[PDB]
Nucleic acid binder design. Structure first.
Ligand SMILES: [Mg+2]
Ligand SMILES: [Mg+2]
Ligand SMILES: [Mg+2]
Ligand SMILES: [Mg+2]
Ligand SMILES: [Mg+2]
Ligand SMILES: [Mg+2]
Ligand SMILES: [Mg+2]
Ligand SMILES: [Mg+2]
Ligand SMILES: [Mg+2]
Ligand SMILES: [Mg+2]
Ligand SMILES: [Mg+2]
Ligand SMILES: [Mg+2]
Ligand SMILES: [Mg+2]
Ligand SMILES: [Mg+2]
Ligand SMILES: [Mg+2]
Ligand SMILES: [Mg+2]
Ligand SMILES: [Mg+2]
Ligand SMILES: [Mg+2]
Ligand SMILES: [Mg+2]
Ligand SMILES: [Mg+2]
Ligand SMILES: [Mg+2]
Ligand SMILES: [Mg+2]
Ligand SMILES: [Mg+2]
Ligand SMILES: [Mg+2]
Ligand SMILES: [Mg+2]
Ligand SMILES: [Mg+2]
Ligand SMILES: [Mg+2]
Ligand SMILES: [Mg+2]
Ligand SMILES: [Mg+2]
Ligand SMILES: [Mg+2]
Ligand SMILES: [Mg+2]
Ligand SMILES: [Mg+2]
Ligand SMILES: [Mg+2]
Ligand SMILES: [Mg+2]
Ligand SMILES: [Mg+2]
Ligand SMILES: [Mg+2]
Ligand SMILES: [Mg+2]
Ligand SMILES: [Mg+2]
Ligand SMILES: [Mg+2]
Ligand SMILES: [Mg+2]
Ligand SMILES: [Mg+2]
Ligand SMILES: [Mg+2]
Ligand SMILES: [Mg+2]
Ligand SMILES: [Mg+2]
Ligand SMILES: [Mg+2]
Ligand SMILES: [Mg+2]
Lengths: 155, 260, 124, 188
RNA sequence: UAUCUGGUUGAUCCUGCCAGUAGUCAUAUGCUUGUCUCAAAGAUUAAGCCAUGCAUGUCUAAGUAUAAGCAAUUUAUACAGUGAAACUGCGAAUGGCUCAUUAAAUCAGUUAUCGUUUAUUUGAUAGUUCCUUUACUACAUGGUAUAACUGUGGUAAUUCUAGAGCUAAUACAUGCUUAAAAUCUCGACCCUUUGGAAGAGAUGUAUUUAUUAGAUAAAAAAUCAAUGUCUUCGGACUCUUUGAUGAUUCAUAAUAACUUUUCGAAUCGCAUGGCCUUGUGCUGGCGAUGGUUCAUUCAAAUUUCUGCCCUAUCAACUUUCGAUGGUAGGAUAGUGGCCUACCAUGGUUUCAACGGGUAACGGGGAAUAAGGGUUCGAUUCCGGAGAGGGAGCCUGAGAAACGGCUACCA
RNA sequence: GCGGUAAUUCCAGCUCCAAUAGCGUAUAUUAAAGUUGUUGCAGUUAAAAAGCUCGUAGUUGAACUUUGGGCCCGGUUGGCCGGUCGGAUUUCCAACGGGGCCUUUCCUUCUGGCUAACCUUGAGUCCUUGUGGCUCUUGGCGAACCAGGACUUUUACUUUGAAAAAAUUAGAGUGUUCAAAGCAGGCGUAUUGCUCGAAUAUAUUAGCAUGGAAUAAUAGAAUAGGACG
RNA sequence: ACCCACUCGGCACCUUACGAGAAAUCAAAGUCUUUGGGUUCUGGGGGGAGUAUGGUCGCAAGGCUGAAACUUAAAGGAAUUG
RNA sequence: GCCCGUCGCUAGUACCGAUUGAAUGGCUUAGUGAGGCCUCAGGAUCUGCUUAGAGAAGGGGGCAACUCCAUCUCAGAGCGGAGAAUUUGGACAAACUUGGUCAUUUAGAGGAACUAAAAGUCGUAACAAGGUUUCCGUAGGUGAACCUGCGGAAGGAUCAU
RNA sequence: CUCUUAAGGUAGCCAAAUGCCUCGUCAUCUAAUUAGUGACGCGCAUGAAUGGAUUAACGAGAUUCCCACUGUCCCUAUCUA
């Protein structure tokens, strides 16, 4: 989530070991570091253009993505820089040779290089434990809005 | 459970050992060593259950304590010592040399080899990194470290090893179409030359195989061990040459060879 | 801590306990072949019960199926090798037919009697 | 002792979790160093698998790097000034990571007025050469220069004294200094 | 291996249950019991209580022998064999037993460590240790202080031990050292240039911090600050060096330093040989135990996806006193509300949350044979948990250990 | 259901039946049970349709979008011969599958690395009167997959395969004297060794890898804020 | 307003029985061992008993939800002849 | 013929119930809080490096002057280590006292059911138009089955003007 | 069944502030209870606006028990005005 200030916290927010010498005059101010996570996920332009820090970002942060890659649909954007997605699936019950609708909710950290809205399908990828719950990080938004500007006024 | 486990129960021991169910309880627990516990042949299982040379295990320690036995040229007094794939077992007395290599049933076979072939071995390089002080090194499936290898030597390539000395004399790049020995899976012990490799970033590359009967199969790259070129291997293969006939085909060969 | 010493039993027991026909039929087998038990008949019909089962199972697979061929021919050659199955009927729709006495006729109890040597299966 | 497990601590649904087994030794944790200033006192800690850890209590000197000058010196740590996590660490002059301290600055002045032959605030042959190949270099910076007048330099602790036993840091420069300066006076 | 029969009525056909029938790696119990093979067995109730004995000890030519021990012989006047006791080392964290707790826990299959610790095994791995650097620092090798022992004792009592006198080490505690080369900052002098220099110090590994390299997505130029090598003295710089991953701030290396300075052999057994300037000189054989970092191996710790019985006469639940997330730190072997501080209001649920029950350890599996199912698994393998109940902790690579200690309760 | 004086049910004797080194009883559970019913129950009167409609969750939900035609390639059974010293393959043949073409037909896409394949043909010919046949470089196939850049609507199902503990189970071989078992064992020169073994199958729900594009979802372009370049 | 023919959509009757059912009967109670269009609900021998208990609604009377111990070989349905 | 209820006898089951009843187990507020662990102190003693004295040693090399290394021994002095009992403050936290909560059991005068149950006493409610057709919902009433009012149903004793 | 009445006590309630007998019987609380409470009811002589039964809340009302508290007591002593 984030959204502005960049510097609002009791501690100075910076990237580790990325030094900008004040002696050497630079027209970009701060030097910024990033990477590609792998697996083909485009490291989005809002990460390289951005001023945010987020050491939990898969591009500009210190986390690696490895293990499961999953997709779910965004059910909650409430807590800061993290969301909950619902993943449905049908569970096969052999005696009745039929299925039942089930789901799980996966808490996942989302860098403020993505603007996530509720309802978005999102591609998410696994992580070292980021928090008590979050084991995953949002690596791609496969949705958009689902007809947001088609919600407008009359003739 | 509070620390390292020192025992092995029978039925817990791997099945390619061919240990009988009864006559006691436990199995020999392979010592820490060059080869993984679950793929290995402790010296006792070899010198006894295969070669029938000693009846006890109490006898098997009498053999090794005279230093008859030597593994890959060093002596090796350890009863449960984890001998493994590509290792050379030499009995000084009885002039005998072996190389540990796989059946098509996945079992280690007694395989006798020439005195002169017994002085070299094939490692598969598992990893190659840049070590202390800029010295690049290579390490092989059996846990050897060879410092200063050829730059061209990459992971999954195999390596010829001097035994007597340590050094790498030659290597074989991992290449479409090279003689391959499966170590793992149910295709363990088949020998198939490499059709082509499935990539799979994120894990588990697959290596497609076609043996000299024009049968095909797949395994995971981890189970593929390069031995050479189609036709010419770099080691003496065991009888059957890792082909794997069907139950039918094998029932016929064994019942066609009959007349006394 | 050992290997379990394994086992299984050799006989099945009749569903309906009192059936005059089946008790008549059974005693006549003990009378002919020299049995001490109804269990010795139970034992055999249990062997037959599973052989028919295995043959029932194979017969449903496609002809020239790898399994049907390997296990079907093997069952046959074993029933020939003892002498229950006739050399002509070697293709196992007879093993599906068969019957109890074909097994009973093959007992060393009976074969000591069959060519001389005994004369009264009880003496056998 | 302390236990870092998750077996206490209700599951995400809020459900209360039963106690399964007892406290294991490998999920253990220990008490803070709460390291203070002056008169070096250090206790090693035998940790998992041999492995000493050095728990600093009471450090006076540390090793501090001027990063834009590419040199490191050892100075007296004067005291703690700002801390992001807890203020009691400042008031008690407790040393932990990210703690903002003040240091001696005379080891840094002596280097600068030697290396650059310039001095701050306000004859030998070879040295004259060197000092000419420098400057157009020596412009330093305002906010870093005025601190030598007071003889005390703002530096942020980058080490983990309750872990390594070392209290180390880097002199504040650039945006960092501008930040923590604003915090000081607009809180002061 | 797809079967049914007796019981409602005066009789009938139904509905429907009771009864019969068969099996049970399913216990008990009664009566009966000759042979071979196989051999489960204090699980159920009371993870209730325990007499006594036993169940963890251990030595190679190769750490320590003045036993006032044995043997004497066989060269051994320092020792030399054998060897109690004791030290030192390693082991006692494996095994075995039990199933009480445990219901998203365990466990299973499948993952992750680019999130860690790891004795041992196995492969590699170390010329740098001192010091204002000619009147040098033990290296032909530096320091004591202890057991056993000797002797004096205490107590009803224990694997209780006190005072006194000795003496060892691969115990304890110290502490020298080795080639060449290059690179760096200093810089006495001399001389003006475009500029160069004697000789002084620093530079093992590990630790901590800051900085830098670690390229590569197809091609070219100018200017600023420094400053490299080659002059055919305007100027040029040509050949130009690059590891792995899907991915890294990776492997590895460079600079300024930092450290109550990690390691860099004061060890042991066999043999005894060359080589001359004849010093017992300088060399030197096989392998033992060690030793730092890296790798391997036995592991461990966490960890992704999905899967548990009954219950709504449990519908709301979670944040007292972390509940869900953000920042920083502390703590850890290390990730993480693990913990703390500050901040926010989050997280779960009729797709059944939460709560309750379980005469619940989970799994491989067992019983029942049309198929579909139903039932069971304390229990020979795997995993987990425990040692009367709780908690705590020393030792250690590894235990929150109980045939370890400390405390409380019984 | 028997026993209230001739008891086919009790207490005995005789005789007889079933199972037999075992047989009875108790308790549990399974089959019988289509009396738990997915397969597969029943509900007018036997137990059972809520007094009635609305209605959320849940389950379910009409039809329609590349169909048809032409050619090529090579497989595996089976027929009629067998050429041959039980099995062999060519021509004749049907049958059943697989691959790929062209019919207006993305095959993700460039940027080359690669080529195995003919529209090629350069010579002509082994040989049946010749398109029966392949060696063979000089204009002329992309996809068979390397690897870099730039991007990609989501699924369910189904196929094949990998990763996979052993004991159990299913099951092959072997005459433990039979058998339950076991994983042995079998051959001579039994005076100095020879030799086959120690298979195979299941192993599903989930995850992974591959093929299929029917069935069933999902998304797309209408204030054009469309698609191409 | 009536008559006649056809067509939707009703309230029913009549005759049939291919068909269903234990029957009585039934144009559904049919298209069901040749067993699957979609979906909701209730029953599992009789008595105990719609009782106890808890919850809930109501002024109350009472409504919804709703057991078990124990007992028991029948209870019951339609049709037949007396 | 069947048959219904009160009433009476024996026996069994569970319910209600004063006792603010009892017992077991799982959590848990508050209070008190052992113990090891970390930490501020502590110094029973027992040594360290430094500084100086007095009495002897060994020579870096001289005719007198001149001078290093290691080692023992007692007046006397600066600046660090070990380290017992003890002790400050912590986190962890058994346990005790008193409460609460959940689960599982359970005693009880008496009350009120039901069964075994067929029958005994009193009547005749139902089954025939059961002699007042039967049953439903509700409401009041009476030894007892039941009666009666208002609406239903036919499962009626009427498929019918 | 009998006498007999204007009718012959219904729903309730109880040894109740209504019961003689009476310190009723049973249960509970206690070491022990002519006390209290819960039951029982042929109730000397309970009972329906002579109002019956129930009843949250309220009480310087009568009564029983518990916790806390105490010189009420054991057993008394000392101090101030
Ligand atoms: Mg928030
Ligand atoms: Mg071992
Ligand atoms: Mg009867
Ligand atoms: Mg009857
Ligand atoms: Mg009758
Ligand atoms: Mg039965
Ligand atoms: Mg047991
Ligand atoms: Mg027990
Ligand atoms: Mg001696
Ligand atoms: Mg010795
Ligand atoms: Mg164990
Ligand atoms: Mg000492
Ligand atoms: Mg509700
Ligand atoms: Mg946080
Ligand atoms: Mg249990
Ligand atoms: Mg179970
Ligand atoms: Mg189990
Ligand atoms: Mg179970
Ligand atoms: Mg149990
Ligand atoms: Mg016990
Ligand atoms: Mg407790
Ligand atoms: Mg313990
Ligand atoms: Mg014990
Ligand atoms: Mg133990
Ligand atoms: Mg008589
Ligand atoms: Mg009789
Ligand atoms: Mg079905
Ligand atoms: Mg039914
Ligand atoms: Mg009915
Ligand atoms: Mg449709
Ligand atoms: Mg490709
Ligand atoms: Mg009480
Ligand atoms: Mg204290
Ligand atoms: Mg009547
Ligand atoms: Mg009437
Ligand atoms: Mg009346
Ligand atoms: Mg009725
Ligand atoms: Mg009274
Ligand atoms: Mg009174
Ligand atoms: Mg009187
Ligand atoms: Mg009183
Ligand atoms: Mg009273
Ligand atoms: Mg009264
Ligand atoms: Mg009155
Ligand atoms: Mg009133
Ligand atoms: Mg009173």
């Amino acid at each position: 989530s984030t959204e502005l200030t960049v510097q609002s916290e009791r501690a100075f927010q910076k990237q580790p070991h990325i030094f900008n010498n004040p002696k050497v005059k630079t027209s970009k101010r701060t030097k910024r570091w990033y990477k590609n996570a792998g697996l083909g996920f485009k490291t989005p332009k809002t990460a390289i253009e951005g001023s945010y820090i987020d050491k939990k970002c898969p591009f500009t942060g210190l986390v690696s993505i490895r293990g499961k890659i999953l997709t779910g649909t965004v059910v909650s954007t409430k807590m800061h820089r993290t969301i909950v997605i619902r993943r449905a699936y049908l569970h096969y019950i052999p005696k009745y040779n039929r299925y039942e609708k089930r789901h799980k909710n996966v808490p996942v950290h989302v860098s403020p290089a993505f603007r996530v809205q509720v309802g978005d399908i999102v591609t998410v990828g696994q992580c070292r434990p980021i928090s008590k719950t979050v084991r995953f990080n949002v690596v791609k938004v496969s949705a958009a809005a689902g007809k947001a500007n088609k919600q407008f006024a009359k003739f | 459970a509070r620390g390292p486990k020192k025992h092995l129960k029978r039925l817990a021991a791997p099945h390619h050992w061919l240990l009988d169910k009864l006559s006691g309880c436990y199995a020999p627990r392979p010592s820490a060593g060059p080869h993984k516990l679950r793929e290995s042949l402790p010296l006792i299982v070899f010198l006894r259950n295969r070669l029938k040379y000693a009846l006890n295990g109490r006898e098997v320690k009498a053999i090794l304590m005279q230093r008859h036995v030597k593994v890959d040229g060093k002596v090796r007094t350890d009863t449960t010592y984890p001998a493994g794939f590509m290792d050379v077992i030499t009995l000084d007395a009885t002039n005998e040399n072996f190389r540990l290599v796989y059946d098509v049933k996945g079992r280690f076979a007694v395989h006798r080899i020439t005195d002169e072939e017994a002085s070299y071995k094939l490692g598969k390089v598992k990893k190659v990194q840049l070590g202390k002080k800029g010295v690049p090194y290579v390490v092989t499936h059996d846990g050897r470290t060879i410092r200063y290898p050829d730059p061209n030597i990459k992971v999954n390539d195999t390596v010829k090893i001097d035994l007597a000395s340590g050094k790498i004399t030659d290597f074989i790049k991992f290449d479409a179409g090279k003689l391959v020995y499966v170590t793992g899976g149910r295709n363990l012990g088949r020998i198939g030359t490499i059709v082509h490799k499935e990539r799979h970033d994120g894990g588990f590359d697959l290596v497609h195989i076609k043996d000299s009967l024009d049968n095909t199969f797949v395994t995971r790259l981890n189970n593929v061990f390069v031995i050479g070129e189609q036709g010419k291997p770099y080691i003496s293969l065991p009888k059957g040459k890792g082909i794997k006939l069907s139950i039918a085909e094998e029932r016929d060969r064994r019942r066609a060879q009959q007349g006394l | 801590p050992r290997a379990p010493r394994t086992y299984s039993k050799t006989y099945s027991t009749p569903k309906r306990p009192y059936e005059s026909s089946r008790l008549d039929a059974e005693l006549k087998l003990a009378g002919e072949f020299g049995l001490k038990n109804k269990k010795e008949i139970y034992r055999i019909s249990f062997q037959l019960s599973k052989i028919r089962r295995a043959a029932r199972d194979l017969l449903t697979r496609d002809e020239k199926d790898p399994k049907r061929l390997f296990e079907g021919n093997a069952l046959i050659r074993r029933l020939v090798r003892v002498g229950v199955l006739s050399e002509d009927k070697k293709k196992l729709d007879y093993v599906l037919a068969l019957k109890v006495e074909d097994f009973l006729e093959r007992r060393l109890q009976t074969q000591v009697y069959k060519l001389g040597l005994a004369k009264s299966v009880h003496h056998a | 002792g302390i236990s870092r497990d998750s077996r206490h601590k209700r599951s995400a649904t809020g459900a209360k979790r039963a106690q399964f087994r007892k406290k294991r030794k490998f999920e253990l944790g220990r008490q803070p160093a709460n390291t203070k200033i002056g008169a070096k006192r250090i206790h090693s800690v035998r940790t998992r698998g041999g492995n000493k850890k050095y728990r600093a209590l009471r450090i006076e000197t540390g090793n501090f790097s001027w990063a834009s000058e590419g040199i490191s010196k050892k100075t007296r740590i004067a005291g703690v000034v700002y801390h992001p996590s807890n203020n009691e660490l400042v008031r008690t002059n407790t040393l932990t990571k990210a703690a903002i301290v003040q240091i001696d600055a005379t080891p840094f002045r002596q280097w600068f007025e030697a290396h650059y032959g310039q001095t701050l605030g306000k004859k030998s042959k070879n040295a004259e050469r060197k000092w000419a190949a420098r400057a157009a270099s020596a412009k330093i910076e305002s906010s870093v220069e005025s601190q030598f007048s007071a003889g005390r330099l703002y530096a942020c602790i980058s080490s983990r004294p309750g872990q390594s036993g070392r209290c180390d840091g880097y002199i504040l420069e650039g945006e960092e200094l501008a930040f923590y300066l604003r915090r000081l006076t607009a809180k002061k």
